[PDB]
Structures are given as C-alpha cells and as structure tokens.
C-alpha cells in the first residue's frame, strides 16, 4: 500500500501489553561479571536464555535454527532488532503513576476540579475522598480532604494515587454528561472559561475513542539502542549507555515493592515505597523537578530522560528531521578564476572520483576498462595512481550531469544553485565569481560541501532549476544578483570616464590652424572650437553597420590612440562622438546577443562610467532577452571582464592616498572657532552640556566639509588615476571609507553613550596619538559585538520565520476574490507635516511585478483590471504619478485571498526572479521566510526592533494609543500632562506623563495620541480599536522601516506573504454546531464551516491576532509543530483526540520520508507525457 494520514494518540494500558506483546519484567542485569552479553533478564534477546532451545517455533520458515547451546539461527547473530522496535512488557502492576500528564493541567487537573495539589494525592500524601456515605464534619462530597488521619477519622476513601485510575471507567459515561452537564453552566461572565477548556477535555474524547487510561500500570521501554561496547584510540577505551541505568530505577523498585508487602509491611512504609515507582516513572519520561544525576551522590550531569535529548530540542528530534546526512557528500576549499563560467565548476580529479565511483565502475563494464564490476574498486585501491584512460572515462559519469555546492552558513536558497562539472588539477575546488556574492563570504580560504544527487529523476529535478545559470540572475528579494560585483566593474569602469585632462580653450577656424598647428604643444582633448565642435577630431575612423568600424580598435592597435577614453569620431549607425574607450563596450556586449542594434537602445553611453547601472543593463537585457543570453553576455564581462583590469592594472601607493592640500586650513579654522567657544563657557554663558553639543556640532559639521573636499580634488585633479576613487563611486568600496583613509575621520564616540572631547588626529598617512588608536578601538570593537550577536541571534528569528510560514504553496490559478488592497503611494513624512513621495523603491519592491486591482485610468493609456505590472509599468505610474490621478494604486497580494490551502496563482505579484508571474506549484512558503535571507548580520540586536513588533509584544512604553476619535480635549494641569478625548457619548483618561507635550485640536480614529510618533503601541489594542483593518498594515510598513535604513532590496510579496499567518486565527463568538464559544479555531476552516453549513445557521467569528511564534505552534496539524518551547505540552493535547493530522505539509512529508507536496511533487503535477506518435498510436488502437 502507500502511507497517508498519520494517526497517533493514546493506547490505553490494555494496549501496552499489545505492543509489549510479551518479554520484560524480571531484573535487568546489564551483563554478567563474565561473558559480557545477555543476562537472562534485561536486554535479553527476547527468548534467549543461554540455551532455551525454542522460540524458533513461532517462525514459519526461511532458514534453519536450533543449535542447542551458544546460539541458533536467531537474531543475536543477525537481524537482532534490526534497528526495529521491540517492545518491552513491564511487569508493572503496582499502584498508579502518571505519563507526566504534561504541564498544562490535563489527563487530570481539569477533568475533576483539581490542581495546585492535584498531585498532593496523585503523588501520595493526601487522598481523593471518593465514596458516598454520610460524612460528619460537614458532609463528604467526592474530592480530596483526607489530610491523612482524616481518612482515619472514619476509622471507599484512599490517598492512593490509584484514584485517578478510579474515577476512570467512572466519569467516562458521565462524559455524555460533561458534554451535557457542564457547558450548561452558562454566563455570569468571568468563570466563562475553564469549562471552556473542559469542553475539549471531554470533547477530545467521546466519539473520538480513547479513555482516561492515563493512570499507569505498564511502562514500556525498548532495549536495542544501548548494548554498545568497547571504544579505543588516542589516549582512552571502556563503553556503556544511558536510559537503561536510568530505566533500572524502575523495575528494581516495582520489583522490591511486591516482595516488600507480601511479607506484610504495614502502612507508612507501603506508600512511601510504592510511590517510588511513581517517582521512578518520572524517569524514562522527563527529568523535570529535582534531578537524578549519575555518580550519586554526584553533583552533576542530567540523565538523558527524553529531556534536552530524545524528543527534546536539538538532540534527536531537531536533529533527525533535517539534521540528516547525505552520503556522497564531502567538502573542499575555495577558488575562482575564468573557466567557462556558469554550469562550470572546480572539482579535483581524485577528490571527485569517489563521488562518482558507482557508475564509474558501470561504464568500465561493457566498455573496456575492466570485466566484472567485481574488481572495479579493486583497481581504485591504495591510490594506485590510476590515471591511465580511467580519467578518460570518469567524464562519462560527469559529462552533462551536474552537482551541488553549499555554504556555511546559509541564508539564501541561492545558497546552493549547483553547477555542471569539469575538472582542472589539484585539490581545492574552484567556482565562478559572481556566485561569490550569493554567499557574501569572502575568500578567507573557506570551504564548501559538494553533495551529489544521484536519482535521474532528481538531476533533471536539478540543473533545470538548479543550474547556477537560472535562479541566480534576478533573484528573490527584488533586484538582480548574477551581476559582476567588485573588480569587473573597475575593469570596464576604466574603459570609460571621459578624461578631460584640460589643456586650454584656444580657438580654431576648422582645422587649418589650431587643429594642425596646436599639435606642437598647448591644448588637446579639451574644449576648443572651429564653429561648433571641440577636439574630437584629427582621426576620422569610419565604417558602416558592417563587422568593423575598423580604425578605432585597429587605430589604437598601434602606438596611436589611447584605448582609454581618448575621443575619436566613431561610425556605426551614424556619426558617433564616442571613443573606442566605449565603442568596444558595445561590440563585446554586442557579440553576446548579436547585431549591436539592440545593445544600442538598452545600454547607456551618454554617461557610461558603469557601477550601479550595470545591475540594470543585465536586468534590462533580461525582460527583453532571456537567460540563454544573459549567460553568454553576463559571461563575457568575464573574459574581457578581467583582461581590461589586467592589461592596464591600477595599483595603489602610500602616496596615491592624496592628502587634500586644501586641508590644514579647514582644520585650523574650526579649532579657532572652538577656542572662543571654550573661552566662552569658561567665562559665564551656556551650561557645559550646551557647549558640549556645540564642540561636537562643530566637527559634527566640520567633518563633512573635509569630506567634501577630497571627493573632488580626485574628480578634477587625478580623475581615475587615484584608483582609491573609482573604488567607492561604484565598483568596490565605500565613500566614508576614503575620508577615513585620507581625510580625517574623528567624530569618534565613548563606550556607553556619550561622545569624545578631542577627535582623531588622522592624516592616516601618519600615525595616531595612542589615545587615537585607542578611542578608535573603543568604537571599533563594538562593531564586532554587533556582528557576532547577529549571527548568533539569528538562531531565534530566522527559525521562527521559516516556521510560522510553511504550508504556504500555490496550486490552482483563479480564486477570483474581492476586497482589493491599494498599495500606498504617498507617505506623511514627520520632518515634513505634508507629503513627500517615497524613495521610489518601496514602491518598486512594493509593486514591482504585481496583479492589478480595479482598472488603471490615467495619462491617456488605460491599464486593464488584473494585469502583471511590468517594471516598465511601475514607471508608467511612478514617473506618471506626479500629475495627480493616482495616489493609491490598487492590486491584491496576501493581505487577502481566503485560501490557507496555499496562496493561489497571480495573487503574488509577478513572481520575483524569473521574468514571469508565479510559476505553478512553487512553494513560496520557502522563499517566503527565505525572503529575510540577507538580513541577520545586517541590523542590530544590540539595543532587535525587527521583532519587538513581529511578535506583537506590547513594545517598550509604546506611548499608548487613542482608543477612538472625536473631540480634541486638551486639559492642562500640574504634573499630569494628560490630554484626552470624548464626544457626548463616552471615553476615558489618557495620561501622557512627563514625556511628550505635543497638542492637537480635532479627533482622529487611533493616530497615536501623539506620544509614540513612531511604531503604534501594542496592536493587541489597535486591532481592538480598529480591526485587521490597520493591523495587517502598520507593521507591514512599520517593519520595512527596519530595512529602509540598511539597504534592503525587498518588500512587496515576501514580508506580506507572512502576515496573513499572524492574524489568520480567530476567537469564535456565540455560534452553533462546531462549539467553542471561546475557541481559537483556524481561519479558512471557519469559512467552510460558515459555508457548507451556512446552508441551514450562524458561525459569526471575530478577527484575532496572536504573535508569530505562538502562530507557528499549534497548527492545522500536529506533525510539524513541536520544534519549540513546550515540547511535551503540544504532544499532550496531541494524543487524546484521535488527531489524524491531515498531510499536505512538506516539513511533514520530509520527516515521514514522503515526497514534499510542492515544486514537482504536489497535487498539481502527477502529469504524464511519454508518447511517440505510433506509441500513442499504439494505445490509440490497443485500447
């Protein structure tokens, strides 16, 4: 058959024995002082007691057995457990117990009235005074009160923890009561709960089988996992296991009990013992109380009791769910260097081999090499320098096929890609540049694993999606990625930058003079004039739209023109001004696609330079071209992409860092200004804190000036020459990193939160005054802490993300839903209490490729309702916008689309990455959270604000909201700067302490009451004072705000395909049928349950907002989940109710070794295809 819905839950003690089947009880001799194995009691091989001479009867056939002594054809030698399960029976019959009954008050606590001591009896010390028989001191009832001796005042009724096992087959039929009976306790308010949770309690059981068989009478531990034995080398051996010595605790007790009672052990003793079992049971289970250290007394380690390990987090569960292991894996160092780039990959002859060893043999079969594979490995032995023709074969395992390539760490699916292969020499693996960026991890000699998918249905299920030349061009987040990052730029950048060395501005009369003459001295590639031209003359260099302007390249070919933008007159489509220092550009990028014709348009030549407009060109080539070229092209800026930077170079010299000879002047100045500034406070005017802000605010500003300077001396005096320049404009290098270099850089601040008197005595071409390279250090190291915190805190934020979002897939395409959501277009800037126009990016990555809402009339061209707004179009509105016919463009994203079944097609703007709207199937769920796959490092735990909200945590202070709206109300007073609101109906007291003192004379629904101008308070009250209205937003833009001050090339889709979650949940409100007046049920189900059922009664829900983590936990299933804080707790209310746990849930499948319903596995694609006409014309006559 084939797996499906995964059931679980209880298995009443009656069941224990079922699996238990038999085997157990007795003692657990962990071996003999002699022949190590067996013991005839514990991990004893089922029916193996030295020479049982039996048991082999149960087995039908297969092979012989029964060898009298020693051992027969049993499992002990082979098939011993076979890693399979083997249940033990436990002899357990003693009093009671408790399978932990968790830490949420279930399987007891609730189902009575009990807790805070529901264990005052269960853990023998009180009594659940069951038994009806006229009490005395004030009636009896049926619940704990036998404070010992009292249950001796009568001298049923028992302290014994068997009472839970008592009212068991008892308050079971009364379950048809609790169902009835209880809930009937309606209204009054407050107390409205309990019974609520109580409902499920009963409601989990009932027509959902099971029993309160939570009382225990037969723990059931296996044996396999332990019988591990002697480990040598280096410096120690001897060998043993845990869970067993942990197990023992039990049986011994449960054994000593019986024989220590039968011999009449009156009262006191009895309980004090028995209970041992109880405690002894909280063993194999969860060590959560006082502990049970080994080495007893032993003040040490924790017994691996399913806590911190096995089931826990990061021990077994968090380990074997994803922390698995390939088997053809491996690793290696890191290289780079022109090859064929893309689809190509380093990989070292030998190193490789093995990965392919299998087939290797195979090909060697029929085709020479060797005969039977038998040998094969027999030839791969002790590095018998194979080489000979073999190598000439491995490339038949290689050839065409491909492999992967990962990185440590990984915060981007880019993180793998995978390249086809080839092979140079020596160890260490090479890789093509760009990809480098897709790892933002320099070449500090790092390594990278190179797994290798083997299954044919995995390869195609790779390269054509994995090939580094596919999901690396324009990537998720927004912009592109497979661009020539550093270096390559300079290599070309150089081949551009006009050059105007300025020599003069004489004059001419059309070449006779000046032109001719001047070529003796004075003037050159300057301004000049003959009637309307400068000095782009002398060399005509012409041609036609053929295959060579000829001259140009051929002109410089000799000791003539300077390839670097010297300026001659070109000829291609028509009289070109440009120099070969740019025409070449085209040609190459031209030769890529064909007929420079196209290049022309696309490219920008009237401002070459190149830097941040390269992303573009490629990025634009895309839309208009399509991968199969992007490669060739993006893969040309490779060859030449280097040679230029090569046959040109551009070193660096202590010198090169040019001190701005217009410096020592600026400096001097300020100080002076300071001089008095100080010889001012020093007199009698302005408190210290005053001049403080001053002295700083003097260089705080003097700086920028010094900054300004250098960034020009360069761009006039020594344009490109100062290589320390074109490395910051755009190519590889920051700006406030040069002024640091040459300038001065000296604002420098203290440790905690104040700024230093003096600044840095730069002239970094000269030393520093100790204190300098000191206070500098002060600030310097703090960077360090921020970087390691982010990388180490990422452990809390990315995992939760990845989680809360998960099932988000997209089968089908056309759930045509209503309520559109217009993307904001103009934001109130609180610097300008008017309206700016947004950086024109948030828009971009906030509308870049989307699925329009309702018509787009404006500027003459009409954009039909429901259309994928191409980048080309955002402009069409972006630039357009101005006019004023659109201030809120419409479209639909995840802020609506009632289908938690996935996310459906065309609802996720375009599809970011591949030029096209969401392909079908795509498990955006991934990319989703994997969107925040370039944040971490880049941020600041060190306050962290990217979650204060993300988890709906009522922030720090928040500066509380404005409940509703209406009447101003500005009541002045003593020390309570409390301003309020009202309007003939009602309101309250809004106290704004000795903090914000900003008024207002109007109303406003919830604005902010004006204290926290930034980030509304806890939406936990906004949704309340509004609804998902403005609670599926705020954050949405309130978030980005933590990215809009740290680059970030994402928005739109991604971060908005997460929210949906956080609120989806609901808190039922007075319905009928599916019960749970309180409840918390899932979204979409409610719909269905307020649909199919609609055809009756009501189900009236109520939007509800949680957090994120809380969101991740308790979900549509039970399978996934766990992986968090309350490991047990979820498994608790997991069993009970049959809980079948649907299926569609990837993380699910994965674990359960089932295909992941998505990508190329989900419902949408089971498709077929094979058919070769006469084959399809085979069943076309055979059917």
């Amino acid at each position: 058959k084939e797996v499906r819905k995964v059931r679980i839950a209880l298995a009443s003690p009656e069941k224990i024995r079922s699996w238990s089947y038999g085997e157990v009880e007795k003692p657990e001799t962990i071996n003999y002082r002699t022949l190590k194995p067996e013991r005839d009691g514990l991990f004893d091989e089922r029916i193996f007691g030295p020479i049982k001479d039996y048991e082999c009867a149960c087995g039908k056939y297969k092979r012989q057995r029964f060898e009298g002594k020693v051992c027969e054809r049993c499992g002990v030698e082979v098939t011993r457990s076979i890693v399979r399960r083997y249940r033990m029976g436990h002899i357990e019959l003693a009093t009671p117990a408790a399978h932990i009954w968790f830490v949420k008050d279930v399987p007891s606590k609730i189902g009575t009235l009990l807790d805070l001591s529901a264990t005052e009896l269960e853990q023998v010390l009180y009594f659940n005074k069951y038994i009806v028989l006229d009490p005395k001191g004030a009636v009896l009832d049926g619940v704990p009160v036998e404070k010992r001796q009292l249950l001796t005042d009568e001298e049923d009724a028992r302290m014994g923890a068997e009472a839970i096992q008592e009212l068991l087959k008892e308050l079971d039929l009364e379950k048809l009561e609790r169902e009835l009976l209880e809930e009937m306790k309606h209204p009054s308010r407050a107390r409205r709960a309990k019974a609520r949770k109580r409902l499920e309690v009963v409601r989990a059981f009932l027509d959902s089988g099971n029993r309160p068989e939570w009382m225990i009478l037969e723990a059931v531990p296996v044996l396999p996992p332990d019988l591990r034995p002697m480990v040598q080398v280096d410096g120690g051996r001897f060998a043993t296991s845990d869970l067993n010595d942990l197990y023992r605790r039990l049986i011994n007790r449960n054994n000593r009990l019986k024989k220590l009672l039968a011999q009449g052990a009156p009262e006191i003793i009895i309980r004090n013992e028995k209970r041992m079992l109880q405690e002894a049971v909280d063993a194999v289970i969860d060590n959560g109380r006082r502990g049970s250290p080994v080495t007893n007394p032993g003040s040490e380690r924790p017994l691996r009791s399913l806590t911190d390990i096995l089931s826990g987090k990061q021990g077994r569960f968090r380990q074997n769910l994803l922390g698995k292991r390939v088997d053809y894996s491996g690793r290696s160092v890191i290289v780079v260097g022109p090859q064929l780039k893309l689809h190509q990959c380093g990989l070292p002859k030998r190193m490789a081999l093995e990965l392919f060893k299998p087939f290797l043999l195979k090909k060697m079969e029929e085709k020479a090499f060797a005969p039977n594979v038998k040998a094969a490995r027999r030839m791969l032995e002790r590095q018998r320098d194979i080489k000979d023709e073999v190598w000439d074969a491995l490339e038949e395992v290689i050839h065409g096929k491909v492999v992967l390539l990962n990185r440590a760490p990984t915060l981007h699916r880019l993180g793998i890609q995978a390249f086809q292969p080839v092979l140079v020499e020596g160890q260490s693996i090479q890789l093509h540049p760009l990809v480098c960026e897709a790892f933002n991890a320099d070449f500090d000699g790092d390594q990278m694993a190179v797994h290798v998918p083997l299954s044919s249905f995995a390869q195609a299920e790779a390269r054509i999606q994995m090939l580094s030349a596919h999901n690396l061009l324009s990537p998720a987040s927004g912009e592109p990625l497979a661009k020539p990052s550093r270096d390559i730029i300079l290599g070309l950048y150089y081949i551009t930058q006009v050059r105007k060395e300025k020599k003069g501005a004489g004059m001419a009369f059309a070449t006779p003079e000046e032109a001719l003459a001047a070529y003796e001295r004075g003037e050159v590639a300057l301004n000049a004039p003959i009637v309307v031209a400068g000095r782009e003359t002398s060399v005509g260099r012409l041609k036609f739209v053929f295959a060579n302007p000829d001259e140009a390249l051929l002109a410089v070919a000799h000791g003539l023109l300077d390839l670097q933008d010297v300026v001659t007159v070109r000829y291609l489509g028509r009289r070109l001004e440009t120099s070969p220092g740019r025409i070449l550009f085209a040609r190459i990028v031209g030769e890529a696609v064909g007929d420079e014709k196209v290049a022309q348009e696309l490219i920008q030549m009237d401002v070459p330079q190149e830097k941040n407009s390269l992303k573009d060109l490629v990025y634009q080539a895309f839309l208009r071209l399509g991968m199969e070229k992007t490669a060739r092209l993006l893969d040309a800026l490779k060859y030449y992409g280097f040679t230029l930077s090569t046959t040109s170079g551009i070193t660096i010299g202590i010198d090169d860092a040019v001190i701005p000879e217009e410096k020592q002047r600026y400096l001097e100045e300020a100080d002076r200004k300071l001089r008095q500034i100080e010889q001012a406070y020093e007199m009698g005017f302005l408190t210290d804190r005053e001049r403080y802000d001053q002295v700083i605010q003097l260089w705080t500003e003097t700086t920028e000036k010094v900054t300004q300077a250098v960034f020009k001396n360069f761009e006039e005096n020594y344009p490109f020459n100062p290589l320390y320049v074109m490395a910051q404009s755009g190519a590889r290098g920051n700006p406030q990193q040069i002024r640091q270099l040459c300038g001065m850089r000296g604002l420098m601040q203290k440790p905690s939160g104040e700024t230093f008197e003096v600044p840095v005595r730069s002239s970094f071409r000269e030393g520093l005054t100790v204190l300098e390279y000191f206070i500098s250090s002060h600030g310097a190291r703090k960077g360090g802490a921020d970087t390691a915190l982010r990388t180490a805190d990422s452990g809390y934020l990315t995992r939760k993300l990845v989680d809360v979002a998960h099932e988000i897939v997209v089968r089908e395409a056309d759930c045509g839903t209503t309520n559109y959501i217009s993307v904001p277009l103009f934001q109130m800037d609180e610097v300008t209490r008017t309206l700016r126009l947004r950086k024109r990016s948030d828009i971009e990555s906030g509308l870049y490729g989307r699925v329009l809402a309702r018509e787009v009339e404006a500027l003459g061209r009409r954009l039909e309702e429901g259309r994928y707004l191409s980048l080309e179009d955002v402009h069409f509105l972006i630039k357009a916008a101005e006019a004023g016919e659109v201030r809120e463009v419409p479209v639909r994203s995840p802020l609506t689309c009632q289908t938690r079944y996935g996310v459906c097609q065309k609802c996720y703007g375009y599809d970011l990455s591949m030029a096209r709207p969401v392909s079908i199937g795509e498990a955006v769920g991934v990319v989703a959270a994997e969107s925040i796959g370039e944040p971490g490092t880049q941020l600041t735990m060190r306050t962290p604000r990217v979650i204060e909200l993300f988890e709906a945590r009522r922030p720090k202070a928040k500066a509380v909201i404005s409940e509703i709206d209406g009447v101003v109300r500005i009541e002045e007073g003593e020390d309570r700067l409390s301003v309020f609101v009202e309007s003939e109906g009602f309101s309250k007291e809004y106290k704004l302490p000795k903090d914000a003192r900003l008024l207002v004379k109007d109303g406003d629904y919830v604005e902010a009451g004006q204290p926290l101008t930034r980030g509304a308070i806890d939406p936990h009250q906004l949704l309340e004072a509004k609804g998902p209205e403005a609670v599926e937003r705020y954050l949405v833009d309130e978030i980005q705000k933590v990215y809009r001050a740290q680059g970030v090339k994402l928005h739109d889709k991604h971060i908005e395909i997460v929210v949906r979650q956080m609120l989806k949940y609901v808190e039922v409100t007075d319905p009928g049928d599916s019960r749970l007046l309180e409840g918390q049920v899932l979204e979409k189900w409610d719909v269905e349950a307020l649909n199919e059922r609609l055809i009756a009664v009501p189900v009236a829900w109520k939007p509800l907002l949680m957090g994120v983590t809380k969101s991740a936990l308790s979900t549509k299933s039970w399978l996934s989940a766990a992986s968090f804080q309350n490991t047990t707790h979820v498994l608790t209310e997991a069993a009970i109710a049959g809980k079948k746990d649907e299926l569609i849930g990837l993380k699910e499948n994965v674990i359960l070794g089932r295909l992941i319903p998505a990508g190329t596995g989900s419902d949408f694609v089971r498709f077929t295809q094979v058919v070769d006409q006469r084959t399809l014309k085979a069943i076309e006559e055979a059917r």
């Binding site: 054509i464 392909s919 077929t1168």
Partner: protein, 92 residues
C-alpha cells in the same frame, strides 16, 4: 544554461511541470532502450571527447532537446500508467 532552455519554461504551464516531463521521457527514453528518442539523423546530440565520440550517456539531455520536435505531448493522457509498458514489447 540549458540548450534552448528559453523555449521551455514558457512553452508549458509553469517551470516544474516542465522539468518534470523531462526526467520521465529520459529513463523511459534511453533507459528503456537507447534507440527510442524521436530524433532521427545527426540531430541526435553527441560527445566528441578525447579521440572517440558517442551519445552522451547522460540521457537527461536528450529529452531536453527532444522537446524540440513537435513530437511528444504532456498531460492527463492514457490512464494506464502500466500500459506505458504496453510498448514494453514493441521495443522489447
């Protein structure tokens, strides 16, 4: 990237659905007897490596390139997943 890859992704309903088809008409293809693909003359890719040549044993690429001959369809056709072996005799 992939030879003609651009003529793929679109000429379908969506990425995966493509890749999918591919790796089927592969085993099914070559793995079900090398001589099976639609290609006829030399349009059948080769591997002119060292001194000698031969059809790339990497089947996987035939299909890619096989999806360039009008032949072959893809979709809920012929429900007898078994009968895909109905040819498993006509091609032996």
């Amino acid at each position: 990237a992939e030879p003609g890859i651009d003529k793929l992704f679109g000429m379908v309903d969506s990425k995966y659905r493509l890749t999918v088809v591919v790796a089927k008409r592969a085993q099914q293809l070559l793995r079900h007897r090398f001589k099976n693909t639609v290609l006829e003359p030399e349009e059948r890719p080769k591997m002119r490596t060292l001194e000698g040549l031969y059809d790339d044993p990497n089947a996987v690429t035939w299909a890619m390139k096989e999806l360039l001959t009008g032949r072959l369809f893809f979709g809920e056709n012929l429900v007898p997943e078994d009968r895909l072996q109905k040819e498993m005799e006509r091609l032996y």
